[PDB]
Design an enzyme around this catalytic site. Structure first.
Site, PDB file in Angstrom:
ATOM      1  N   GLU A 121     -36.922  13.680 -10.164  1.00  0.00           N
ATOM      2  CA  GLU A 121     -36.077  14.711 -10.758  1.00  0.00           C
ATOM      3  C   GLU A 121     -35.077  15.272  -9.763  1.00  0.00           C
ATOM      4  O   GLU A 121     -33.968  15.649 -10.159  1.00  0.00           O
ATOM      5  CB  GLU A 121     -36.939  15.824 -11.381  1.00  0.00           C
ATOM      6  N   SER A 175     -37.268  26.230 -15.552  1.00  0.00           N
ATOM      7  CA  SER A 175     -38.494  26.984 -15.819  1.00  0.00           C
ATOM      8  C   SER A 175     -38.907  27.781 -14.582  1.00  0.00           C
ATOM      9  O   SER A 175     -39.144  28.991 -14.652  1.00  0.00           O
ATOM     10  CB  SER A 175     -39.614  26.027 -16.245  1.00  0.00           C
ATOM     11  N   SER A 178     -36.333  25.376  -7.855  1.00  0.00           N
ATOM     12  CA  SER A 178     -36.419  24.478  -6.710  1.00  0.00           C
ATOM     13  C   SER A 178     -35.183  24.660  -5.838  1.00  0.00           C
ATOM     14  O   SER A 178     -34.067  24.803  -6.351  1.00  0.00           O
ATOM     15  CB  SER A 178     -36.515  23.006  -7.149  1.00  0.00           C
ATOM     16  N   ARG A 190     -36.472  19.054  -0.353  1.00  0.00           N
ATOM     17  CA  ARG A 190     -36.841  20.234  -1.133  1.00  0.00           C
ATOM     18  C   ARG A 190     -37.365  21.281  -0.159  1.00  0.00           C
ATOM     19  O   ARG A 190     -38.493  21.182   0.329  1.00  0.00           O
ATOM     20  CB  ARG A 190     -37.882  19.890  -2.197  1.00  0.00           C
TER      21      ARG A 190
HETATM   22  N1  LIG Z   1     -31.627  27.386 -25.683  1.00  0.00           N
HETATM   23  C1  LIG Z   1     -32.529  27.651 -24.665  1.00  0.00           C
HETATM   24  N2  LIG Z   1     -33.839  27.536 -24.863  1.00  0.00           N
HETATM   25  C2  LIG Z   1     -34.662  27.791 -23.864  1.00  0.00           C
HETATM   26  N3  LIG Z   1     -34.310  28.166 -22.655  1.00  0.00           N
HETATM   27  C3  LIG Z   1     -32.994  28.306 -22.392  1.00  0.00           C
HETATM   28  C4  LIG Z   1     -32.059  28.043 -23.399  1.00  0.00           C
HETATM   29  N4  LIG Z   1     -30.818  28.246 -22.895  1.00  0.00           N
HETATM   30  C5  LIG Z   1     -30.943  28.621 -21.624  1.00  0.00           C
HETATM   31  N5  LIG Z   1     -32.264  28.674 -21.300  1.00  0.00           N
HETATM   32  C6  LIG Z   1     -32.784  28.998 -19.983  1.00  0.00           C
HETATM   33  O1  LIG Z   1     -32.921  27.736 -19.346  1.00  0.00           O
HETATM   34  C7  LIG Z   1     -34.161  27.716 -18.637  1.00  0.00           C
HETATM   35  C8  LIG Z   1     -34.607  26.260 -18.503  1.00  0.00           C
HETATM   36  O2  LIG Z   1     -33.620  25.594 -17.708  1.00  0.00           O
HETATM   37  P1  LIG Z   1     -33.685  24.015 -17.408  1.00  0.00           P
HETATM   38  O3  LIG Z   1     -32.767  23.711 -16.230  1.00  0.00           O
HETATM   39  O4  LIG Z   1     -33.336  23.179 -18.623  1.00  0.00           O
HETATM   40  O5  LIG Z   1     -35.204  23.790 -16.993  1.00  0.00           O
HETATM   41  P2  LIG Z   1     -36.278  22.621 -17.127  1.00  0.00           P
HETATM   42  O6  LIG Z   1     -35.731  21.430 -16.459  1.00  0.00           O
HETATM   43  O7  LIG Z   1     -36.556  22.432 -18.636  1.00  0.00           O
HETATM   44  N6  LIG Z   1     -37.551  23.213 -16.342  1.00  0.00           N
HETATM   45  P3  LIG Z   1     -38.101  22.451 -15.007  1.00  0.00           P
HETATM   46  O8  LIG Z   1     -39.284  21.542 -15.418  1.00  0.00           O
HETATM   47  O9  LIG Z   1     -38.704  23.498 -14.169  1.00  0.00           O
HETATM   48  O10 LIG Z   1     -37.078  21.626 -14.144  1.00  0.00           O
HETATM   49  C9  LIG Z   1     -35.115  28.531 -19.518  1.00  0.00           C
HETATM   50  O11 LIG Z   1     -36.169  29.042 -18.705  1.00  0.00           O
HETATM   51  C10 LIG Z   1     -34.167  29.668 -19.978  1.00  0.00           C
HETATM   52  O12 LIG Z   1     -34.158  30.725 -19.008  1.00  0.00           O
HETATM   53  C1  LIG Z   2     -40.684  20.632  -9.833  1.00  0.00           C
HETATM   54  S1  LIG Z   2     -41.307  21.548 -11.268  1.00  0.00           S
HETATM   55  O1  LIG Z   2     -40.698  21.076 -12.514  1.00  0.00           O
HETATM   56  O2  LIG Z   2     -42.735  21.354 -11.497  1.00  0.00           O
HETATM   57  N1  LIG Z   2     -40.852  23.158 -11.018  1.00  0.00           N
HETATM   58  C2  LIG Z   2     -41.454  23.983 -10.001  1.00  0.00           C
HETATM   59  C3  LIG Z   2     -42.681  23.689  -9.414  1.00  0.00           C
HETATM   60  C4  LIG Z   2     -43.189  24.575  -8.463  1.00  0.00           C
HETATM   61  C5  LIG Z   2     -42.453  25.709  -8.140  1.00  0.00           C
HETATM   62  C6  LIG Z   2     -42.962  26.709  -7.126  1.00  0.00           C
HETATM   63  C7  LIG Z   2     -42.954  26.157  -5.717  1.00  0.00           C
HETATM   64  O3  LIG Z   2     -42.150  25.388  -5.338  1.00  0.00           O
HETATM   65  N2  LIG Z   2     -44.002  26.607  -4.848  1.00  0.00           N
HETATM   66  C8  LIG Z   2     -44.983  27.514  -5.290  1.00  0.00           C
HETATM   67  C9  LIG Z   2     -44.896  28.825  -4.528  1.00  0.00           C
HETATM   68  N3  LIG Z   2     -44.933  28.540  -3.065  1.00  0.00           N
HETATM   69  C10 LIG Z   2     -45.581  29.404  -2.143  1.00  0.00           C
HETATM   70  C11 LIG Z   2     -46.536  30.317  -2.595  1.00  0.00           C
HETATM   71  C12 LIG Z   2     -47.137  31.125  -1.614  1.00  0.00           C
HETATM   72  C13 LIG Z   2     -46.727  30.907  -0.299  1.00  0.00           C
HETATM   73 CL1  LIG Z   2     -47.447  31.849   1.008  1.00  0.00          CL
HETATM   74  N4  LIG Z   2     -45.836  30.027   0.032  1.00  0.00           N
HETATM   75  N5  LIG Z   2     -45.268  29.276  -0.890  1.00  0.00           N
HETATM   76  C14 LIG Z   2     -44.067  27.401  -2.600  1.00  0.00           C
HETATM   77  C15 LIG Z   2     -44.132  26.189  -3.517  1.00  0.00           C
HETATM   78  C16 LIG Z   2     -41.241  25.989  -8.732  1.00  0.00           C
HETATM   79  C17 LIG Z   2     -40.737  25.120  -9.671  1.00  0.00           C
HETATM   80 MG   LIG Z   3     -35.318  20.743 -14.725  1.00  0.00          MG
END
Ligand SMILES: Nc1ncnc2c1ncn2[C@@H]1O[C@H](COP(=O)(O)OP(=O)(O)NP(=O)(O)O)[C@@H](O)[C@H]1O
Ligand SMILES: CS(=O)(=O)Nc1ccc(CC(=O)N2CCN(c3ccc(Cl)nn3)CC2)cc1
Ligand SMILES: [Mg+2]
Ligand SMILES: Nc1ncnc2c1ncn2[C@@H]1O[C@H](COP(=O)(O)OP(=O)(O)NP(=O)(O)O)[C@@H](O)[C@H]1O
Ligand SMILES: CS(=O)(=O)Nc1ccc(CC(=O)N2CCN(c3ccc(Cl)nn3)CC2)cc1
Ligand SMILES: [Mg+2]
Lengths: 352, 352
Positions: A121, A175, A178, A190
């Site tokens: 991703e 969600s 990153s 990352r």
């Molecule tokens: N129509 C919508 N429905 C849901 N969420 C939306 C919408 N439009 C904007 N958002 C926002 O977009 C965010 C999700 O962004 P997005 O970049 O598509 O994440 P994702 O790839 O699905 N999640 P991730 O697995 O963490 O990479 C949601 O958490 C909302 O804050």
């Molecule tokens: C690729 S995804 O789709 O699954 N999205 C996604 C997955 C994970 C995270 C959180 C993250 O990256 N964490 C967790 C928090 N963390 C801490 C926590 C406590 C300390 Cl002391 N230090 N670090 C660092 C690492 C964000 C988005």
């Molecule tokens: Mg995404």
């Protein structure tokens, strides 16, 4: 087979579709009705079922890709409705990224003979971001910033050149969040992430206000006053905390005024929506700034769909990054911010 | 005049009181009944009015301070009730720190002839922390950590030596969070802060669960399951995200499962309390880790009253700091964690 790139995230599925526009007379004959039905369905509709949307304004027209001319289309729908998408597909080679490429691998393979190729991703994000910036947004800049982000009478969207994009800090707000440090086209890491992202905004907003859509949460937040919920530096000091340069208006404790029962009883839903948005956005900005200082990178680009139709958060990020960095960092934004993973996946097609 | 040190924070007032125990026969005669009434009131009561509490277990016995032997007492009450405290005082030199030393300056001066000396809240924190560690906790270590914080069958509180305390990262979790880098006894800086602190925990908890005390919020959180509200890496990927070392159990989006109406309808108040605690604590840990890496400091000490009677958050910090730093950082804790500012203020008395 149609050329598609798919990013199946925790919340949204993003789809990039290349529609060829140089279809010769013989190519059109030797095309199966199923393929023609797909192309016509996608290009003649802007809504797909009840939850799919084509973002028509993002379309790249007359792009040359894999030696063909065509239009690149951008389509999204909720991951919750992926079963409907797959069921429609059951009644071709798919480059897919995001967590759902793994989670729903077996589901995609219920489509007979379909070849599913999972791609990382963050690799796809970097490749798609660099590609779209390179071809431009139909001759306009893909990248922009808010000029003079500290003065609202002056603050305005302006284009930004990323011809030499390295190094670059990419903050992907989906969600969760990153954070990537990109040093070259094949050298990136990352740096970290935070779980206070777009899903936190939407989830907390729904709990606190009863809103039932992202757009409704933003509309509530635009009407609210976050200082009704937040405790500010001036609520603690009576003014600025001069010794450490903290202005009276800075938030000292998010939702910190909600420890008082009388304040919980007078706050509005709109105030709570705005406090949720401000809390999440400032935390993202602050984490971005710390990573930028540690990575020694001064250009910070924010992507992901938390910022789609969300100018409040973009302006807050622009202002906050500039203010708290004393002008050392600049917040950058991209027109195709939610779709780079899906484009990067599509770009992996020649390898298969 | 009695020797008091006061830290008036955004949420709590902390008071350090030195009770002399070497009172000679002549000194006791030449003492005014008002002073004797104060001393007896403070040493014969453990609750003061409806909201004041003396933390008897923290008392330092037979301390030599300013050339006198005495006991150092530790007392707290809500800043909301400071008007009651001042009114009791109306019906001496006061060293005071925290934001309230400025905000309530004029109120303290309604006490006739009282001399109020404002001292900086982070100067007082550093001075008080170094002092208490130096004199020890009645012969025991002031500083401790959780040994083998990754294995619960082994994890246990153990003492930590701070004889050479520099450099040190101090994370002060009060209403908000301040992060200090301490390089020597007179060389320290406020690296940054975050507004996601103890007031956020208590404010959001009260909004989400209806709890009406810090202790009740913690009791709810101890009964809850935060994964009912949070979206985990395994909810997005189906497992670990191996490429970037993210385990399936890591939180990807705090409250991220609350975007689904059916999940909002089945989550308990205890689950929401625990998700609030986990969200705030992990964010503090992550910010601490980034600051530690940037400051090149490997010892991180957490203070402030967000952690009083809060072993859940202490163990989460200990585990998270060790896990995410690959063992490079250690979370340290202090027995007198909420009171260092008040002690530091008291220590400023000879300058006046
Ligand atoms: N129509 C919508 N429905 C849901 N969420 C939306 C919408 N439009 C904007 N958002 C926002 O977009 C965010 C999700 O962004 P997005 O970049 O598509 O994440 P994702 O790839 O699905 N999640 P991730 O697995 O963490 O990479 C949601 O958490 C909302 O804050
Ligand atoms: C690729 S995804 O789709 O699954 N999205 C996604 C997955 C994970 C995270 C959180 C993250 O990256 N964490 C967790 C928090 N963390 C801490 C926590 C406590 C300390 Cl002391 N230090 N670090 C660092 C690492 C964000 C988005
Ligand atoms: Mg995404
Ligand atoms: N009895 C209590 N009442 C209120 N809050 C408590 C109590 N016990 C623990 N806490 C926690 O302690 C936090 C306040 O910690 P504290 O270190 O005293 O901050 P403060 O100095 O008053 N605030 P600040 O102005 O930001 O420095 C609250 O936000 C709660 O999370
Ligand atoms: C001394 S107190 O009693 O008043 N408590 C107290 C006061 C303020 C704070 C927050 C803080 O320190 N902030 C604000 C956030 N911030 C950002 C924000 C966006 C970006 Cl991009 N960068 N940085 C850095 C500075 C915490 C506690
Ligand atoms: Mg304080």
């Amino acid at each position: 087979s149609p050329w598609f790139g798919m990013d199946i995230g925790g919340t949204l599925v993003k789809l990039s579709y290349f529609e060829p526009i140089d279809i010769t007379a013989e190519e059109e004959q030797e095309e199966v009705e199923s393929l023609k039905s797909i192309r016509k369905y996608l290009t003649s509709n802007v809504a797909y079922g009840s939850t799919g949307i084509r973002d028509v304004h993002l379309e790249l027209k007359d792009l040359t890709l894999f030696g063909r001319r065509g239009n690149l289309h951008f389509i999204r729908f909720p991951t919750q409705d992926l079963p409907t998408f797959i069921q429609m597909g059951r009644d071709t080679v798919l480059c897919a990224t995001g967590g759902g490429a793994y989670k729903f691998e077996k589901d995609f393979r219920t489509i007979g003979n379909l070849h599913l190729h999972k791609l990382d991703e963050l690799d796809c994000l970097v490749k798609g971001l660099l590609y779209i910036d390179s071809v431009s947004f139909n001759g306009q800049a893909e990248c922009y910033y808010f000029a003079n982000a500290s003065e609202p009478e002056r603050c305005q969207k302006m284009p930004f050149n990323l011809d030499d994009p390295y190094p670059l800090l990419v903050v992907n707000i989906g969600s969760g969040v990153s954070i990537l440090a990109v040093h070259s086209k094949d050298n990136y890491k990352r740096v970290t992430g935070t779980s206070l992202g777009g899903g936190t905004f939407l989830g907390l907003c729904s709990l606190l206000t009863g809103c039932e859509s992202f757009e409704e949460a933003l509309e509530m937040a635009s009407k609210g006053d976050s200082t009704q919920a937040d405790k500010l530096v001036r609520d603690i000091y009576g003014g600025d905390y001069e010794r450490f340069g903290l202005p009276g208006w800075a938030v000292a404790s998010s939702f910190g005024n909600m420890i008082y029962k009388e304040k919980r009883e007078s706050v509005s839903k709109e105030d709570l929506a705005r406090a949720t948005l401000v809390t999440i956005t400032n935390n993202i900005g602050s984490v971005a700034r710390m990573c930028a200082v540690n990575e020694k990178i001064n250009r910070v680009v924010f992507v992901g769909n938390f910022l789609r139709v969300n100018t409040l958060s973009m302006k807050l990020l622009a202002y906050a990054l500039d203010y708290w960095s004393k002008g050392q960092l600049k917040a950058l934004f991209l027109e195709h911010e939610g779709y780079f993973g899906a484009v990067g996946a599509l770009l992996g097609l020649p390898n298969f």
